[PDB]
Design an enzyme around this catalytic site. Structure first.
Site, PDB file in Angstrom:
ATOM      1  N   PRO A   1       0.841  -1.218   0.000  1.00  0.00           N
ATOM      2  CA  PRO A   1       0.000   0.000   0.000  1.00  0.00           C
ATOM      3  C   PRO A   1       0.844   1.221   0.000  1.00  0.00           C
ATOM      4  O   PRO A   1       2.006   1.219   0.445  1.00  0.00           O
ATOM      5  CB  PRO A   1      -0.777  -0.088   1.285  1.00  0.00           C
ATOM      6  N   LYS A  32      -1.361  -5.697   5.819  1.00  0.00           N
ATOM      7  CA  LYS A  32      -0.163  -5.957   5.053  1.00  0.00           C
ATOM      8  C   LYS A  32       1.138  -5.765   5.845  1.00  0.00           C
ATOM      9  O   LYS A  32       1.195  -4.965   6.733  1.00  0.00           O
ATOM     10  CB  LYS A  32      -0.115  -5.042   3.851  1.00  0.00           C
ATOM     11  N   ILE A  64      -3.376  -2.922  -3.485  1.00  0.00           N
ATOM     12  CA  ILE A  64      -3.889  -4.069  -4.229  1.00  0.00           C
ATOM     13  C   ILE A  64      -4.831  -4.834  -3.343  1.00  0.00           C
ATOM     14  O   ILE A  64      -4.393  -5.574  -2.413  1.00  0.00           O
ATOM     15  CB  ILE A  64      -2.726  -4.955  -4.786  1.00  0.00           C
TER      16      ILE A  64
END
Lengths: 114, 114, 114
Positions: A1, A32, A64
């Site tokens: 990110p 993440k 994503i």
């Protein structure tokens, strides 16, 4: 990110450790690993929000996946909170654009994430 | 809406009142209340357009709706006109990326617009 | 096409001729004439990648078409290569967001490309 904040707050008002705090909080929020989180803070900008040059921020979060209605509400609460506590910006003077990126549309390390 | 302009024109060449002029005209063009319009002008940038460092601008307009072929043509005439008159940038040295944002993908005031 | 790079590398570390080199190489990679290529380099930025502040870059490539899985893999190899050779940024500290733009969503010269 990737998280980017552009603000008219002066550089001196950005606390030491702010980029690390953003990294940590975003890793927790997105789930993440911190190794994949990139952060970019741009102070001293010439900006207006509703016609006013009082403190404001325009931000983006690209990831994503991990982007959607409920998640983005939660990110907004988190990030407006941080910008209010650390930069003294009112939540109602912050916009955050969220982007759910296709892996094939993110380049990294001579290739893409696809 | 959020309107961002990055330019190699120097700061001193950005006239006083320009952010307010943008705010006003964007409110009128998009039909959105001025309170929701944010603007960000970034001078003194290291950029080229067509290989040349003559005055140029790279811009973006994000909006929740009010984006489309005819509307975007109108915005481009408006915005190129303002950049030509105020910053002396030729219209054929301006790119504007338009983004129609889903309300769920725009954070504001601890939540999103959805 | 339009390529932007934000980096923590200082301005003095951006070599002379870099914007031209990007313009040339991007023209070749995308297959578009250099007259249509715009490039923008933003040094001295306050950024972190993976929690740390060694040289890094956050970039975008916007193009009307010429965006897809294979092409973006090729662009990434090219662009990471350039940033490593010229700015001494490790490819594993670069993210590039690719955007395939509709012609009606790109303003230029008082209208759009539609």
């Amino acid at each position: 990110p990737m998280f980017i904040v552009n603000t008219n707050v002066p550089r001196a008002s950005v606390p030491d450790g702010f980029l690390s705090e953003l990294t940590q909080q975003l890793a927790q929020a997105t789930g993440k690993p911190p190794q994949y989180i990139a952060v970019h803070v741009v102070p001293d900008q010439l900006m207006a929000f509703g016609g006013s040059s009082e403190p404001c921020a325009l931000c983006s979060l690209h990831s994503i996946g991990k982007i959607g209605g409920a998640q983005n509400r939660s990110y907004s609460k988190l990030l407006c909170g941080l910008l209010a506590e650390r930069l003294r910006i009112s939540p109602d003077r912050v916009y955050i654009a969220y982007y759910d990126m296709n892996a094939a549309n993110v380049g990294w390390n001579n290739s893409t994430f696809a």
